[PDB]
């Protein structure tokens, strides 16, 4: 194979590093900031994750602090009919 890699010196460890890159930038991370599980929408197309036709009219409207909300997250900030369907009870 091959090797090569010194530094006694470890840069900062952030929670808030991709889970599928393991790193960040001075921008905010997608999906959001603060939701500690950060990780880029395209890792997600990409790896096999999300792959799914959503055809839509915006690139990218996250950073932004009233934006795209995660999954885990799934806040219902925006302002917009969320129309939901819980358990008949
Ligand atoms: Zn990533
Ligand atoms: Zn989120």
Known sequence: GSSGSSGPREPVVNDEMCDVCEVWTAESLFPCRVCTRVFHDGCLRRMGYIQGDSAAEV????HTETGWSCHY???????????????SG
Not at 59 to 62: G, H, I, L, V
């Open 73 to 87: 997250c799934d806040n219902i900030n925006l302002l917009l009919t969320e129309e939901s369907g819980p358990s």
């Open 59 to 62: 690139t990218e409207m996250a």
